[model samples]
Target chain A: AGTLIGQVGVQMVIGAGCTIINGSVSGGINQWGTLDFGSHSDLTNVVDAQTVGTSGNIQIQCSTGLTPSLTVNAGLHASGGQRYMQNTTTTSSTIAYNIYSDAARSALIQANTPVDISSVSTGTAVNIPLYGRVVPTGQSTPTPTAGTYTDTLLVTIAW
Target chain B: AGTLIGQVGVQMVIGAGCTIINGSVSGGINQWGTLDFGSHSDLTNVVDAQTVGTSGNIQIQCSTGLTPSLTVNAGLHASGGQRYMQNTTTTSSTIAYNIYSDAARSALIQANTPVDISSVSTGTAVNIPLYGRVVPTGQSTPTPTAGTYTDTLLVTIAW
Candidate 1:
């Protein structure tokens, strides 16, 4: 909350003049994504593994120098190209899990596990982006149908 | 980030300190846990699902009054409590599936997910607690060993 000049900070005129309706793809491939560290880019945040996949769940490790996050924002989709943008902080984020139709697909670990991440921050002011993974329960080939689907996640942080 | 002024916000410094170690007695039942936000507490800012049955992998949804960005600071885990917390922006909050473990017994969803949410004008900061569901993947008295287990979820978000 500053003026349009150089003091504690200025208005820092910002413009939102871009849009891209990426192609559609299916699950577990790779999708749109990014992890920004804004003004505190030098800040060393941490993403740790809290639970193990012992309950019929698989286990995944986190990235070094950062918290545990990854995703198939644009990696798995076909016509679905990927994209990324950086910010000073990350409060929450959205992802397109390159979803594909699964007609005869009915397995627990087939690729039905569609996931999306909320935003993140350092205890710092600005929030950062969380690079998460898109593990599918399963996907149908030969195309099941062409449609649009989305999901959300409510996250909790305990110290 | 800065030295405290002489008071906290506009409210008086009620107590020296207050910490929340949420837990509940096993109520003569097999096991028990604590809750957050108290009873009847509304759930807001959920990006996942409300409940993922046994053997379920992941669940995601959309934010009601959420920012256009997100971060996967850590993995997603199962949360047992927290019925409070309102969403001024969205009419309903989003829910996601997480992982958890119980001693000796077992669970189908064994993990947790954590993320920070940023509001449009900042101040939309809400920390979602660990969320998960209970299901018998194979065991009879479903329960996880009373040991520190773990899992990693690569969370990424986009708008």
Candidate 2:
């Protein structure tokens, strides 16, 4: 009984020396994002060269030691050669806008297209604009309505 | 000879070789949602439907290998033909409500439904609405007293 008690006491006192250590862990991204464009409001649709909508850029850093490809989906309100921002109040109402790789609006941004940007390095960040111009030319639905319109898009990268 | 000593030292150093190294990496969903229907004083009645002027959308992005599909649970205070936003102050007060798939309310947004939007692709984002309305048809089991009512819903997804 004394021997059994000693063993039991040591087990209890030691708690089996079994401190149930518990934990969960996570890993840093091998391929991760450093920055994303913040949402904007009160943009313009003027045709003048000086009157472009506010510029926002997508910033991504991929340094997996492998070349990666990127794809961008046109905004949800996209249509015939244009991506429009729809009025929150009424789905039928929208404002005309166009996204481009350049501020000059030369090459169009197609939906689900694999974007072409130079290979990004871990030390350097790559910032590509979701460059947009709000204009009257592509205004369908018989000229756009005067109100706040918005859209959301996506960007993905793969090795 | 000094040449023999140098060769012996170099060979001994070379015999002490080092071990090989290995590693792994991962990432998470850097996205979420924000919902606010503003505030109301006397949210309509038995016959006419009262609409909250401001509605928000649920937006999420996953950088996983597989495509993610989403499903949602109904509100915390839904029962007996009444989906209510119960007052945080007390359960004694509430506001009957409904969420819609679209601004037109043509399709109902119910719990466990494969949210009206399509399965979100890994590369692209899809933004559908959380359009809401407050009506009183089911307010019969003792009408909701005046108070600021609130409720939360969970959105689950599987890849």
Candidate 3:
């Protein structure tokens, strides 16, 4: 028999596995989550913190034991290294705001800075918490122009 | 000229007088007072009522002993006989709101209906109080498209 019992070995290589499986995550660059500050007549008082999504947090699925981190850019209307949302009607009008990685808002998520997430990926979607706030002194003026102010942020996920 | 000192009679007429003197009042048509509802992410909860102006109420100057009444027409974005603020970007999207004549929000200021002001005009500016609110069940939907929504209401003052 020509079939010699030669020692054969089979091996497979699997790199770090991480994927954004969030239903709301769009294609291309994967835009997901919204941090709405709502509406305010004036910035004389602090605008309460709002979450990334209405119903839940941004979800990401990764391989078990793999670590994942997230980063948010300065946004479309950032100026002087501060995040801002510009008025759609009056482009000159803008409101300053900040993002945090924790509910206490102690950890400020700096622009383009990555924050390590502590999670044991169980092959299921892992919740990512993001909080947003607008302080009384953060806006361009105490009374922002009457109109809608908006900003778009680019979020990146890496493992 | 000596002529007969014919019986001469002198008569003067002074009609009821009232005018809107608010600094923010516009020229033609007199558009004044802004009942800004501010901004909101969703209509899941009741949005607290807001005042007409930031620092003070709408002011109107009237002749002494004259009673003045104010009427607010259906806003530019009203539909189905209801007041609404339309999304600038998405015209189809709108938020339902109401204007009240009392702080308790007991009296709804209906369109084209005049509400008598109790202020005894002293030839000085009389403060007019107006309040606005957006209940959770009032909006067209729970979550409205993200954008600035606005509407203009024609306020008519009659003495």
Q: Quick one: best TM-score, which candidate?
A: 3
- Pick the DockQ winner: 1
Mind giving the per-residue lDDT tens digits that candidate 2 earns over A9-85? Answer: 43322111101011111352122111211222222113212111124223444343444444556666667755556
Q: Report residue A15 deviation for candidate 1 (angstroms).
A: 46
Give all TM-scores, in the order shown.
Answer: 0.18, 0.32, 0.43
User: DockQ for each of the predicted structures, in order?
Assistant: 0.01, 0.01, 0.00
Q: Write the per-residue lDDT of candidate 3 for residues A1-159, one digit (tens) a residue.
A: 010011111111113445443324221223455676776686787666554554566555566765668788898877788888887888888778888887677888999888887563775665555778778774656886689877888776655
Give candidate 3's error at residue B50 in angstroms: 4.4
Q: B27-62, model 2: which lDDT tens digit per residue?
A: 111123334566555445422232222233343332
Give the lowest summed-lDDT range of ten residues in model 1 chain B: B3-12
Question: Which of the predicted structures, 1 or 2, would earn the higher TM-score when compared with the native?
Answer: 2
Docking class of 1: incorrect
DockQ versus reference, model 2: 0.01
Of 1 and 2, the candidate ranking higher by lDDT: 2
